[PDB]
PDB file of C-alpha atoms in Angstrom:
ATOM      1  CA  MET A   1      93.075  92.468  86.407  1.00 37.84           C
ATOM      2  CA  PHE A   2      94.505  92.888  89.891  1.00 37.06           C
ATOM      3  CA  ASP A   3      93.476  93.515  93.501  1.00 37.25           C
ATOM      4  CA  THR A   4      96.381  95.985  93.678  1.00 33.63           C
ATOM      5  CA  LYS A   5      97.572  99.051  91.772  1.00 32.76           C
ATOM      6  CA  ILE A   6     101.158 100.244  91.086  1.00 34.46           C
ATOM      7  CA  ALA A   7     101.688 103.986  91.285  1.00 36.09           C
ATOM      8  CA  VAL A   8     104.769 106.159  90.929  1.00 38.66           C
ATOM      9  CA  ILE A   9     104.630 109.772  92.236  1.00 40.19           C
ATOM     10  CA  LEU A  10     107.356 112.246  91.246  1.00 38.79           C
ATOM     11  CA  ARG A  11     108.108 115.771  92.415  1.00 37.13           C
ATOM     12  CA  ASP A  12     106.973 117.876  89.436  1.00 35.10           C
ATOM     13  CA  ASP A  13     109.935 120.281  89.399  1.00 36.11           C
ATOM     14  CA  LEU A  14     112.545 117.594  88.579  1.00 36.34           C
ATOM     15  CA  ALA A  15     114.375 117.673  85.246  1.00 40.27           C
ATOM     16  CA  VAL A  16     113.152 114.977  82.839  1.00 40.37           C
ATOM     17  CA  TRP A  17     116.379 112.962  83.241  1.00 42.96           C
ATOM     18  CA  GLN A  18     115.874 113.098  87.049  1.00 43.31           C
ATOM     19  CA  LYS A  19     112.272 111.853  86.738  1.00 43.52           C
ATOM     20  CA  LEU A  20     113.496 108.927  84.605  1.00 43.18           C
ATOM     21  CA  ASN A  21     116.390 108.127  87.000  1.00 44.16           C
ATOM     22  CA  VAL A  22     114.044 108.244  90.072  1.00 43.84           C
ATOM     23  CA  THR A  23     111.371 106.125  88.291  1.00 44.96           C
ATOM     24  CA  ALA A  24     113.945 103.481  87.401  1.00 47.36           C
ATOM     25  CA  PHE A  25     115.173 103.203  90.998  1.00 50.53           C
ATOM     26  CA  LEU A  26     111.709 103.269  92.542  1.00 49.81           C
ATOM     27  CA  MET A  27     110.525 100.456  90.243  1.00 48.77           C
ATOM     28  CA  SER A  28     113.549  98.307  91.131  1.00 49.36           C
ATOM     29  CA  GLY A  29     112.219  98.389  94.727  1.00 46.26           C
ATOM     30  CA  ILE A  30     108.703  97.509  93.568  1.00 49.49           C
ATOM     31  CA  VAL A  31     109.985  94.398  91.759  1.00 48.25           C
ATOM     32  CA  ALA A  32     112.236  93.405  94.702  1.00 49.80           C
ATOM     33  CA  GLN A  33     109.160  93.638  96.985  1.00 51.39           C
ATOM     34  CA  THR A  34     106.809  91.660  94.677  1.00 51.27           C
ATOM     35  CA  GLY A  35     108.686  89.372  92.267  1.00 53.92           C
ATOM     36  CA  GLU A  36     105.303  87.866  91.330  1.00 52.17           C
ATOM     37  CA  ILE A  37     104.575  90.843  88.997  1.00 50.72           C
ATOM     38  CA  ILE A  38     107.169  89.577  86.506  1.00 54.31           C
ATOM     39  CA  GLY A  39     105.670  87.542  83.653  1.00 52.42           C
ATOM     40  CA  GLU A  40     106.849  85.280  80.826  1.00 54.93           C
ATOM     41  CA  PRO A  41     109.745  86.313  78.564  1.00 59.91           C
ATOM     42  CA  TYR A  42     109.072  88.446  75.487  1.00 59.60           C
ATOM     43  CA  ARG A  43     109.760  86.674  72.185  1.00 64.52           C
ATOM     44  CA  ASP A  44     109.924  88.445  68.836  1.00 64.15           C
ATOM     45  CA  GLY A  45     109.005  87.360  65.277  1.00 62.78           C
ATOM     46  CA  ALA A  46     112.506  86.034  64.652  1.00 61.32           C
ATOM     47  CA  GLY A  47     112.801  83.860  67.751  1.00 62.16           C
ATOM     48  CA  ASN A  48     114.761  86.433  69.755  1.00 63.30           C
ATOM     49  CA  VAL A  49     114.046  86.352  73.514  1.00 64.90           C
ATOM     50  CA  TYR A  50     113.894  89.353  75.876  1.00 66.91           C
ATOM     51  CA  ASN A  51     113.499  90.058  79.595  1.00 68.03           C
ATOM     52  CA  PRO A  52     110.102  89.346  81.100  1.00 61.48           C
ATOM     53  CA  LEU A  53     108.380  92.534  82.341  1.00 56.85           C
ATOM     54  CA  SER A  54     105.718  93.584  84.877  1.00 53.77           C
ATOM     55  CA  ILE A  55     102.387  92.049  83.999  1.00 55.82           C
ATOM     56  CA  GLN A  56     100.681  94.818  85.991  1.00 55.45           C
ATOM     57  CA  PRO A  57     100.043  98.387  84.720  1.00 55.32           C
ATOM     58  CA  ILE A  58     101.996 101.253  86.263  1.00 55.63           C
ATOM     59  CA  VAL A  59     100.422 104.700  86.751  1.00 56.37           C
ATOM     60  CA  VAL A  60     102.837 107.679  86.845  1.00 56.16           C
ATOM     61  CA  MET A  61     101.874 110.887  88.677  1.00 57.37           C
ATOM     62  CA  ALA A  62     103.447 114.190  89.740  1.00 58.33           C
ATOM     63  CA  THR A  63     102.846 116.760  92.473  1.00 57.94           C
ATOM     64  CA  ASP A  64     104.475 119.448  94.631  1.00 56.42           C
ATOM     65  CA  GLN A  65     106.856 118.990  97.579  1.00 58.69           C
ATOM     66  CA  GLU A  66     104.332 119.369 100.401  1.00 59.01           C
ATOM     67  CA  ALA A  67     101.749 117.292  98.572  1.00 59.61           C
ATOM     68  CA  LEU A  68     104.344 114.515  98.141  1.00 60.52           C
ATOM     69  CA  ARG A  69     105.057 114.721 101.881  1.00 60.51           C
ATOM     70  CA  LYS A  70     101.416 113.988 102.822  1.00 57.64           C
ATOM     71  CA  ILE A  71     101.284 111.093 100.312  1.00 58.10           C
ATOM     72  CA  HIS A  72     104.430 109.744 101.992  1.00 58.47           C
ATOM     73  CA  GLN A  73     102.756 110.262 105.420  1.00 54.99           C
ATOM     74  CA  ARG A  74      99.515 108.613 104.243  1.00 57.51           C
ATOM     75  CA  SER A  75     101.387 105.498 103.026  1.00 54.23           C
ATOM     76  CA  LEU A  76     103.076 104.965 106.409  1.00 56.04           C
ATOM     77  CA  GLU A  77      99.755 105.540 108.172  1.00 53.90           C
ATOM     78  CA  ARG A  78      98.251 102.802 105.962  1.00 50.38           C
ATOM     79  CA  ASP A  79     101.060 100.331 106.828  1.00 49.15           C
ATOM     80  CA  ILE A  80     102.408 100.348 103.251  1.00 54.60           C
ATOM     81  CA  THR A  81     106.083  99.666 102.567  1.00 53.99           C
ATOM     82  CA  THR A  82     107.085 101.948  99.694  1.00 49.19           C
ATOM     83  CA  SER A  83     110.042 102.721  97.458  1.00 48.86           C
ATOM     84  CA  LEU A  84     111.334 106.211  98.312  1.00 47.67           C
ATOM     85  CA  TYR A  85     113.894 108.601  96.827  1.00 51.19           C
ATOM     86  CA  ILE A  86     114.962 111.885  98.485  1.00 53.40           C
ATOM     87  CA  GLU A  87     116.701 114.897  96.908  1.00 53.32           C
ATOM     88  CA  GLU A  88     120.003 114.318  98.710  1.00 56.24           C
ATOM     89  CA  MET A  89     120.367 110.926  96.994  1.00 55.96           C
ATOM     90  CA  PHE A  90     121.264 112.811  93.785  1.00 58.46           C
ATOM     91  CA  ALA A  91     124.599 113.709  95.472  1.00 56.66           C
ATOM     92  CA  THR A  92     126.136 110.204  95.241  1.00 58.36           C
ATOM     93  CA  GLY A  93     125.816 107.078  93.134  1.00 55.64           C
ATOM     94  CA  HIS A  94     126.694 104.725  96.024  1.00 54.76           C
ATOM     95  CA  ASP A  95     124.045 102.575  97.726  1.00 54.82           C
ATOM     96  CA  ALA A  96     125.821 102.731 101.131  1.00 51.80           C
ATOM     97  CA  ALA A  97     126.121 106.534 100.966  1.00 50.85           C
ATOM     98  CA  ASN A  98     122.531 107.048  99.832  1.00 50.43           C
ATOM     99  CA  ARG A  99     121.126 104.705 102.481  1.00 51.13           C
ATOM    100  CA  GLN A 100     123.264 106.689 104.971  1.00 49.91           C
ATOM    101  CA  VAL A 101     121.926 110.118 103.941  1.00 50.55           C
ATOM    102  CA  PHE A 102     118.405 108.691 103.703  1.00 47.54           C
ATOM    103  CA  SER A 103     118.690 107.824 107.436  1.00 48.96           C
ATOM    104  CA  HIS A 104     119.370 111.528 108.219  1.00 48.30           C
ATOM    105  CA  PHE A 105     115.744 112.474 107.514  1.00 49.05           C
ATOM    106  CA  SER A 106     112.255 111.639 108.754  1.00 50.10           C
ATOM    107  CA  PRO A 107     108.885 112.096 106.931  1.00 48.74           C
ATOM    108  CA  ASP A 108     108.392 115.560 108.464  1.00 49.32           C
ATOM    109  CA  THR A 109     111.844 116.774 107.261  1.00 45.71           C
ATOM    110  CA  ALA A 110     112.659 114.793 104.093  1.00 43.07           C
ATOM    111  CA  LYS A 111     112.689 116.313 100.600  1.00 40.44           C
ATOM    112  CA  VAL A 112     111.043 113.405  98.797  1.00 43.65           C
ATOM    113  CA  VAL A 113     111.507 113.549  95.043  1.00 47.35           C
ATOM    114  CA  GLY A 114     109.693 110.283  94.278  1.00 45.29           C
ATOM    115  CA  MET A 115     107.733 107.404  95.770  1.00 47.01           C
ATOM    116  CA  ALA A 116     106.233 104.226  94.380  1.00 41.61           C
ATOM    117  CA  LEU A 117     103.835 101.802  95.932  1.00 38.36           C
ATOM    118  CA  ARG A 118     101.858  98.668  95.156  1.00 36.98           C
ATOM    119  CA  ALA A 119      98.798  98.135  97.359  1.00 39.25           C
ATOM    120  CA  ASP A 120      95.102  97.244  97.303  1.00 39.46           C
ATOM    121  CA  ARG A 121      93.628  99.499  94.645  1.00 39.76           C
ATOM    122  CA  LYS A 122      91.226 101.493  96.877  1.00 39.82           C
ATOM    123  CA  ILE A 123      93.993 102.160  99.428  1.00 39.59           C
ATOM    124  CA  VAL A 124      96.367 103.470  96.702  1.00 38.25           C
ATOM    125  CA  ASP A 125      93.762 106.022  95.526  1.00 36.95           C
ATOM    126  CA  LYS A 126      93.374 107.308  99.121  1.00 41.58           C
ATOM    127  CA  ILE A 127      97.150 107.536  99.574  1.00 41.79           C
ATOM    128  CA  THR A 128      97.779 109.371  96.288  1.00 39.51           C
ATOM    129  CA  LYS A 129      94.930 111.920  96.718  1.00 43.37           C
ATOM    130  CA  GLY A 130      95.964 115.325  95.401  1.00 43.37           C
ATOM    131  CA  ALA A 131      98.504 114.096  92.835  1.00 45.07           C
ATOM    132  CA  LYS A 132      98.045 114.680  89.093  1.00 45.44           C
ATOM    133  CA  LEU A 133      98.578 112.017  86.413  1.00 48.91           C
ATOM    134  CA  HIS A 134     101.742 112.855  84.502  1.00 40.61           C
ATOM    135  CA  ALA A 135     101.835 114.535  81.124  1.00 43.12           C
TER     136      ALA A 135
END
């Protein structure tokens, strides 16, 4: 059990492939930020070894555009550093280009399609208010 909680919030209108793509990228940021979540390697019944994974549970949620905006706004207000993915980042597969386009928007104008955060559990619940757990 953990002081913190990991949450991923997606824009509900995304295609399923888009939700999976965004989740993958958001989580890469979460691991980069807190390498301590990675555990021991997985080992199967034949002696095969696999990547170690997050030891901490990950809650996935979805909501609408304007609801995702306030969640974004709440996280900044609470001094949380988040992973963030905007709609325009679907237009290229290049880190430099996507970081560039990302810089063209602010929280009041961005079209956020996903966000992930890891923060003290009570804080996370306040930030994510409104969002629905994903089906």
